Symmetry: C2
Subunit: 330 residues, 2 copies
């Protein structure tokens, strides 16, 4: 009884200590994530100009260098140390730097996915960290469901493509699609789509003459997806369309830099920019959003903690009274 | 010279050995991923019926049990051992089981994100594995960009919501949104949306009387997003709309099971199913797609390898001739 309460109060001090420390690690983490949104908000301002055809090559190659500063900024945030001199986003691997760049050239994650849960009342565990694989690395490319790149065949025309979206989830079919512009037996430009698993979808016959013709800025739709083609392509120009792929914010920014550095003087060079600009905007956003969800998650936990601070002072105010009412037996 | 070629040929045997072994680990892995698509294809058949209002409660509670077998199937695939008796999807942590279920109740990943790259020519490294955090755990919820749940306020009416999509990437704003149905001063039902960061968006004033009215099966749009509301809600009914969040296939299936087990007899119970059915279909798909991208990645690597088998027999056919032409000096 009394040795039991003694050990209950010993439990409570630990539960309050664990809470105080959780509350703090998490608020430190809110501020790093908060910083990292700042960086992305600006990367988004930047990406939007990269799609503005006013800007001189000089203006853009200068944004390229700002984007390089922002990339470096985000690597510092991902590799932040918390109160101990151990990394906040590395998971259980406390002294391994979470994000680095192999000589392969891609950025990798050297942590794990393991969260420390902590007792902060008798039956509530709360996570006191997040991990880099969740926060920074796995974010889908494209519009979140499908991505659009050029093929190995550079395009000769001025065609560009929106990020588009899935409009009918039931009609949706994941596949590797190829969109090929070519000719009617009449002479009209026409739009074809086929795919590894699906064979021909537009049109099912694959015949140019059974094919829909290309209206500038018109919505092309197949297997649950819609997108819009702008500019004037030439026959043989092609785009590839593929399931979304996990891809770090880091390579997203590496990519905004590669793009700001492309030739951007002739109308033909400027359209090979746009298709990819539209994509990179979606990715910057996907990532803005993804981090906000990590922030929302973190908020919920803090509200679980401010819950626990009232509930541990309730469970002590009660143990104190069990002592007063038990010492009265004496 | 000759001791140099001797050591080149020693390098080549290792490059060919590394390739042979890579080619094999990857094809074993294609087949597990291939199996895992099979499981999801069926989970998708299942999810679609779960939204069919023909089915008896008995039919559905039976699919619930099939879905439980499929979940278990996918855990076996995630926890597969390759040729050694070490786990294929655990990363560098070869003898840690990758996916398990804490008593918290959620499924976690106990591996890391680290790929073994292997020399298979003089200047080509190829990855011979993938990791569970990429393959199974981080897949965005909802339609890939935003998700839709009920609030803590159960709904009294028969309203349901599509998975919707982002239609204008530039207008897009990640936020925590609340959609609230309520009354005109006239008496007409009306649709409101506001959000933590955005304050009121529909309408900006927040006044019911400045508000758009609710047309059944009509497209509601705000900050770059569109969605469609079906059924007849009552005032006060609400839905929540939130950035996408990483979430394992596993909890997606756990969720299809919870849903198949909900009350599904009265029209009012059947509409609290649909909103979430639509979501779960998107997630099953997001995951079908995500795995296909891991498969496409794996294919590319095999094509890098069948490249290396011709290039290592070219670099030996050349070293043999350097020996023939060097032993002739003698």
């Amino acid at each position: 009884q009394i040795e039991l309460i003694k050990q209950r109060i010993n439990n409570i001090e630990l539960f309050q200590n664990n809470r105080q420390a959780a509350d703090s690690a998490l608020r430190l983490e809110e501020g790093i994530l908060s910083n990292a949104v700042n960086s992305l908000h600006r990367l988004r301002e930047i990406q939007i100009q990269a799609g503005n055809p006013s800007l001189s090559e000089e203006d853009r190659k200068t944004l390229a260098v700002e984007a390089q500063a922002l990339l470096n900024q985000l690597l510092d945030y991902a590799n932040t140390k918390d109160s101990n001199g151990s990394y906040m986003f590395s998971g259980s691997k406390s002294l391994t730097q979470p994000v680095s760049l192999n000589l392969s050239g891609q950025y990798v994650y050297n942590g794990d996915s393991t969260q420390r849960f902590q007792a902060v009342t008798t039956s509530l565990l709360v996570a006191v960290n997040d991990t880099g694989d969740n926060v920074f690395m796995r974010i889908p490319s494209g519009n979140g469901r499908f991505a659009i790149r050029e093929t190995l065949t550079p395009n000769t025309g001025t065609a560009s493509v929106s990020s588009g979206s899935v409009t009918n989830e039931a009609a949706f079919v994941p596949d590797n699609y190829t969109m090929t512009f070519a000719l009617n037996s009449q002479g009209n430009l026409v739009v074809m789509v086929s795919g590894t698993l699906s064979g021909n979808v537009i049109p099912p016959s694959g015949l140019p003459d059974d094919a829909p013709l290309y209206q500038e800025g018109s919505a092309i739709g197949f297997n649950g997806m819609e997108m819009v083609v702008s500019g004037l392509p030439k026959a043989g120009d092609s785009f590839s369309i593929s399931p979304a792929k996990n891809e770090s914010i880091f390579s997203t920014v590496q990519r905004m830099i590669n793009n700001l550095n492309k030739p951007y003087t002739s109308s033909v060079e400027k359209a090979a920019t746009q298709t990819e600009n539209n994509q990179l905007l979606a990715q910057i956003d996907s990532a803005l959003g993804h981090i906000l969800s990590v922030q929302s998650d973190l908020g919920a936990r803090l509200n679980q903690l401010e819950t626990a601070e009232k509930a541990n002072n309730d469970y002590l105010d009660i143990s104190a009274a069990t002592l007063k009412k038990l010492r009265e037996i004496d």
